[PDB]
Curated annotation (Swiss-Prot):
Encoding gene per record: B2M
Native organism taxonomy: Eukaryota, Metazoa, Chordata, Craniata, Vertebrata
Residues of the full protein shown: 21 to 119 of 119
Keyword Cytoplasm found: no
Protein name, per record: Beta-2-microglobulin
GO MF: identical protein binding; MHC class II protein complex binding; peptide antigen binding; protein homodimerization activity; structural molecule activity
GO cellular component: cytosol; early endosome lumen; early endosome membrane; endoplasmic reticulum; endoplasmic reticulum lumen; ER to Golgi transport vesicle membrane; external side of plasma membrane; extracellular exosome
Organism: Homo sapiens (Human)
C-alpha cells in the first residue's frame, strides 16, 4: 500500500527561441493510479490539442507518459503543465524549465 506521485520533468524539446515554435515535453512519470488529469496550459489558456504518447511500463508499475504541445514562445511568455492526479488533487501549476 503506497501511492506513487507524478514526477514532473517539464523541459524544452527545442531551444526556447523568441518568436519561433517549440514543443513542450511534460514527461510525467510514475502516476499510480493511471487516472491522471494532465490538462496542460499556455499563458493561462487551455490547449485543446493534447498529444499523448503511451501508458508505458518503465519497470512494471510506473507509467512514463509524455504530454506534448507545440507552443509559440513570444518573449514575456509563461507556459505551464497542469498536474492534477488522485494523489495531488489540487491544481499543481508546474513552471516550464525554459532556463535549461
Amino acid at each position: 500500500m503506497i501511492q506513487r506521485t507524478p514526477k514532473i520533468q517539464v523541459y524544452s524539446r527545442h531551444p526556447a527561441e523568441n518568436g519561433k515554435s517549440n514543443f513542450l515535453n511534460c514527461y510525467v512519470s510514475g502516476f499510480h493510479p493511471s487516472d491522471i488529469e494532465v490538462d496542460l496550459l499556455k499563458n493561462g489558456e487551455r490547449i485543446e490539442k493534447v498529444e499523448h504518447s503511451d501508458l508505458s511500463f518503465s519497470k512494471d508499475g510506473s507509467f512514463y507518459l509524455l504530454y506534448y504541445t507545440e507552443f509559440t514562445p513570444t518573449e514575456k511568455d509563461e507556459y505551464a503543465c497542469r498536474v492534477n492526479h488522485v494523489t495531488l488533487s489540487q491544481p499543481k501549476i508546474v513552471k516550464w524549465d525554459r532556463d535549461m
